[PDB]
Structure formats: C-alpha cells, structure tokens
C-alpha cells in the first residue's frame with residue numbers, strides 16, 4: 001500500500017524530509033540510517049534551532065523510535081551496501097548523507113536491496129536531475145537513481161526558465177548570498193576538502209565559495225546549457241538564502257514591469273511570487289522551492305543595450321526539502 | 337598645524353580620531369556629539385571590531401586628554417551654536433549623518449570654521465571625493481566637501497580600470513555589506529520608515545538601496561549613468577564586498593588580462609590580493625579598496641561576454657583611511 005522510504009543520513013535534510021513526509025498520504029518512512037544512536041536522532045528531530053519544535057510526539061523505543069504512534073527502524077551502518085534494504089522492502093531511499101553523490105556510488109543502496117534512490121544533492125554520472133515543477137516530467141519510470149539537484153538550482157531554475165522562455169536568455173551570471181551549512185567550520189580550522197574559505201569561521205564571516213548550480217543548469221533546462229555561471233557568498237545566518245541573477249536578453253526595450261508580471265504568470269506551489277519587502281528570516285520554513293522577490297528586479301539600459309537583475313529567496317533547508325519530497329512522492333507514484 | 341573639530345564622534349568619527357593621531361600637521365582640537373565625556377572616552381578606548389586604542393585617555397574638565405594633547409568636548413545638536421571661531425577651526429569633520437548636504441553643512445561655517453568635510457555622500461553643489469581617484473579635483477577654493485560613501489570608495493578604482501582599459505558599456509552592482517548603526521537591533525519601527533532596515537540587523541540578509549553605483553558620475557564623470565545596483569546587509573559588524581557585473585567594449589577578454597590591469601593600478605588606496613581571503617581579513621585595512629583577483633570571473637557565449645569582479649573593503653576603516661587621506665590633502669591646500 002504505502003510507499004516504503006528509507007532516509008540515509010538523518011541530518012538537516014533527512015530530518016526535514018522526515019517532518020515533511022508525515023503530512024503526505026501513501027508515503028511512509030520505515031527506516032532511518034546515520035552514524036549515531038537513536039537517542040541523538042530522536043532528540044535532533046524533536047528540537048531544531050532554526051525550524052522549531054517538531055509538532056508531533058517523538059518517543060524513543062527499542063531498535064528505532066516511535067513518531068505519533070508508529071515505529072521507525074533506526075540504524076548506524078556507514079556502508080550503505082550493508083543496510084538491510086531488501087529485507088525491509090524499501091521502495092525508495094532518500095540519500096542525504098552527502099557521500100553518495102554519484103550514480104555508481106549510490107548503487108550500494110540498490111546492491112543492499114532498495115528499488116530506487118533519490119540523492120538530496122547534484123550527482124555525477126548518467127542520471128536525470130529533477131527540479132520539481134520545472135522538469136519532473138522527464139521522469140518516466142525506468143529510473144533507478146535520480147538527483148534532487150542543489151538548493152540553489154531549485155531557486156534558480158524556475159526564474160531561469162521564465163527568463164529564456166519569454167525573453168530569450170543570451171547569457172548570465174549568478175551570485176547567491178547563502179546561509180552557512182554543516183560542511184563549514186565553526187572556527188578557523190583545516191578543512192576536509194582542502195578549501196581555504198570553508199576552512200574559515202562560518203558565523204563571523206562573509207565567505208566566498210563556488211557552486212555548480214549555475215554552471216550545471218543545462219542538466220535541468222537543456223535549452224540554456226552553458227549560458228549561466230557564478231558562485232556564492234556565505235554569510236552568518238543559520239538558514240535562508242537569496243539568489244541574484246544578472247542577465248543579457250534577446251528582447252530589447254525590456255521593462256521591469258514585464259519581468260515581474262511574467263514571473264507571476266509562472267507561479268505554482270514550487271515557484272512563489274512576493275511583492276512584499278521581506279528578509280532572509282521571513283522565508284525560514286517556507287515550502288516554495290523558489291520565491292521570486294519582485295522588489296529586487298532591476299534593469300540597466302545605456303541605449304539599446306540592457307542588463308537585467310533579478311532575485312529569488314529560498315530557505316535552502318526547507319525550500320529544498322519541500323521540492324525533494326515533491327520529487328520523491330511523484331517518482332514513487334510513477335511505479336504502480 | 338591644521339585645527340580640526342570632529343562633529344559626530346561615531347564609528348567613522350572615532351576611527352578618524354585614531355587615524356589622525358599619526359598624521360603630522362593635523363591636530364584634533366575639539367569633538368562634538370550628544371553624550372557626556374565619560375562615555376566619549378570609553379568608546380575611544382574600546383572598540384568591538386577594531387580593537388583597544390593604543391594611546392592613553394583620561395577624562396578632564398570640559399573635555400578629555402589623549403597622549404598629553406587635550407581635546408575639547410561639546411554636545412550641541414544645533415551645530416550652529418558651536419564655538420568654531422573661538423577655537424580657530426580650519427576643517428570640521430562631519431560624521432553625524434545630519435548635515436549631509438551643502439546648505440545644511442554651511443552651519444559649521446556660520447559657527448566659525450573655514451571648511452567642512454562630510455563623512456558621507458551629500459546633496460548640493462559640492463565635490464564628492466574618492467581619494468587617489470579624483471582628490472586632485474579639489475583646488476582649495478571649496479568651502480564644503482563630501483568624502484563619498486564606503487561603497488563608492490571601494491567601487492571607484494575598480495571601475496576606472498574597467499572603463500579606461502577595456503571600455504565600460506554598462507554594469508550592475510551588489511554589495512554584500514556589513515550591518516551598520518542606522519539599523520535596528522530588534523524588529524522595530526524605523527526612524528525613516530524603511531521596512532527592511534526596521535528589522536533585526538544581526539539575524540537577517542537584508543537587501544537595501546545604495547547610491548554608490550548610481551551616482552558614480554560624481555567621481556568618474558566619463559562613466560555616468562553606466563552603473564547601478566543594490567546592497568545586501570549581512571550579520572558581520574564590519575567588512576564588505578562589492579560585486580560588479582559589467583559589459584565591456586574590448587573583445588575576447590581574458591580573466592588574466594583583468595587581474596594584471598588591476599595589479600598595475602594598485603597603490604596606497606587600491607590594494608591587490610590573490611589570497612583566498614574572507615570578510616574579517618580586511619578589518620582595519622587602510623586600503624580604500626582591495627581587488628580580489630580570485631573572484632574575477634568571465635562569461636563568454638560566442639562573441640558575447642559578461643565580466644564580474646569583486647573588491648573587499650572595511651566600510652569603517654577603509655573609508656576612514658580614505659577620508660583622513662582626503663582631509664590632509666584638502667588641508668595642505670591652505
């Protein structure tokens with residue numbers, strides 16, 4: 001009956017993927033895997049610094065833990081191949097560890113016994129990369145492994161599409177003012193990936209860092225492949241981010257009114273429209289994958305030449321999770 | 337020595353006092369704010385971001401004493417009622433934020449002082465000065481002057497190199513900027529009705545308007561109307577970054593062309609770095625702007641290109657160094 005989901009890596013996205021699936025019919029989290037015991041998991045689910053107390057009742061039992069009456073088998077196998085997926089009849093695995101961001105790598109879940117895997121990040125290898133309500137239609141059924149893209153890709157894609165579909169994108173650069181993440185250091189320290197900037201203190205700094213989101217957009221919107229590039233500035237807020245896209249268009253004499261009105265026509269559950277003057281903390285916990293802020297739309301014109309600047313908010317945590325669970329639930333209902 | 341009185345002993349005003357303590361022929365003789373001397377001495381001694389001031393300070397009669405030199409303290413909202421003639425003030429450093437206009441600032445002149453330098457952008461017919469970019473514009477005849485903003489001082493040199501070497505066509509700007517005293521600590525009604533600055537400064541990415549890029553023709557007249565853009569207020573107490581996305585005239589442009597052209601125009605005001613630095617690495621730097629060469633990025637789709645560069649700046653000290661730099665030159669023309 002219900003689709004059996006296992007969340008591998010019960011961290012920020014795993015825990016939020018969990019909170020989201022409670023209120024989704026025919027989608028059930030039966031298993032959860034991490035590198036810690038049930039006691040820490042139950043607690044980190046109950047309490048969230050940025051997102052707030054879990055609405056239901058998390059209670060810890062033998063093996064796993066019970067949420068609102070139902071039990072969830074918890075594990076701590078670092079080797080995904082060794083997890084009891086076939087025994088549990090797992091239909092889909094939410095790969096949220098950040099260590100299986102490759103088609104061949106994530107195959108360990110399929111080797112373990114899962115039918116499908118969805119990775120909560122951009123992934124190397126031959127697979128579809130799915131931003132929901134932008135290209136979830138390219139999913140047909142045959143898929144064993146799928147990438148849920150990055151948070152920034154989910155914020156960028158729907159604005160990137162409206163821009164090219166309606167105006168004809170010549171080229172563009174993107175910079176995202178981003179909240180800090182787990183991969184960053186609390187203090188000045190040697191970094192695991194050798195990055196000298198993620199090495200720096202996340203909460204006391206403006207930190208530049210590279211992101212694929214812009215350069216990798218061709219995987220999601222093939223028609224604009226290799227028209228966007230750019231990176232990120234990482235700033236001291238614990239969640240919530242903003243994408244800024246500066247573009248050159250084919251249509252001349254483009255006005256500010258046009259750009260905003262075109263975004264409002266393209267608004268769904270995934271791509272929001274706001275004319276209110278909000279800040280990063282106002283989007284904390286929002287379920288829009290991308291929220292177009294109409295007040296930040298700017299157009300430079302020196303004669304018959306234009307530059308078009310736009311901005312979209314995204315709670316890199318919840319915003320992305322909402323999209324991932326959407327992408328997940330769709331992929332699952334595509335199996336019969 | 338040139339007699340200087342500081343109006344607005346704030347973040348710019350107090351750091352300006354530290355900056356002048358090492359400029360010979362320039363002596364701070366008076367200071368005016370809205371608080372008592374017991375407080376004025378304490379905030380000089382102690383800085384949160386910048387650090388314990390190196391001289392020694394004492395509270396005295398009618399002022400306070402720094403390294404033996406005595407500074408006169410005053411507290412007059414109406415800058416009109418200040419004894420600038422009594423003290424023979426040559427230049428008033430205006431750092432309150434309330435006299436950011438030519439007709440407004442002509443109060444220090446009425447008071448008795450000869451000149452005024454505004455620590456901010458100012459309305460009215462007056463020269464806006466970024467040091468080492470157009471301070472030569474000042475011939476000495478000026479009665480009131482503007483030292484521009486922090487972002488204008490970060491932008492100006494980067495922009496001049498871009499136009500002069502490759503030809504500026506048009507461009508846009510984002511400045512990831514440190515939060516400032518005009519912002520609120522908690523979500524509260526704003527003095528000027530700004531719904532975004534009305535918000536808790538230290539816990540938000542707050543987008544805000546800025547005239548740094550828009551009014552750049554005031555400093556670089558050849559490129560007027562070509563730049564525009566905004567700011568992003570983020571929870572760092574000091575340190576900021578200007579992001580410029582420009583279209584250029586020259587074709588087939590390489591990143592390595594841009595960096596080399598920027599290393600060539602480097603000086604006391606305009607630094608050049610290839611180290612992968614962050615916000616805090618510029619706290620207290622005396623460069624008005626520091627060009628980060630790691631951040632130069634160039635987009636090319638066929639024959640059409642988009643060039644992006646980023647410049648670091650301590651909005652407090654980078655600006656102050658530039659402001660005091662401008663003060664000395666404006667002073668030696670007397």
Ligand SMILES: NC(=O)c1ccc[n+]([C@@H]2O[C@H](COP(=O)([O-])OP(=O)(O)OC[C@H]3O[C@@H](n4cnc5c(N)ncnc54)[C@H](O)[C@@H]3O)[C@@H](O)[C@H]2O)c1
Pocket residue numbers: 008009010011012013014033034035036077078079096097098099101120121149150151181182183316317320
């Ligand atoms: N945090 C965000 O805003 C954001 C947004 C979108 C996508 N992502 C992506 O999601 C993934 C996870 O992100 P996060 O922020 O949740 O990080 P996180 O550190 O909170 O999550 C890592 C979790 O996985 C666990 N883990 C690590 N190795 C494991 C192993 N091999 N086996 C089982 N568990 C393991 C860790 O203990 C931790 O609980 C990354 O790929 C990241 O890029 C993050």
Ligand SMILES: NC(=O)c1ccc[n+]([C@@H]2O[C@H](COP(=O)([O-])OP(=O)(O)OC[C@H]3O[C@@H](n4cnc5c(N)ncnc54)[C@H](O)[C@@H]3O)[C@@H](O)[C@H]2O)c1
Pocket residue numbers: 343344345346347348349368369370371412413414415431432433434436455456484485486516517518651652655
């Ligand atoms: N802080 C920055 O990074 C920055 C950078 C460049 C320029 N500026 C400009 O400098 C000016 C001051 O900035 P700040 O950050 O130092 O602000 P601040 O609040 O620290 O300084 C204001 C100071 O002026 C005093 N003051 C206010 N009204 C007064 C009155 N009329 N008479 C005498 N004193 C008065 C206040 O008590 C306070 O000490 C502003 O124009 C600002 O835009 C600020």
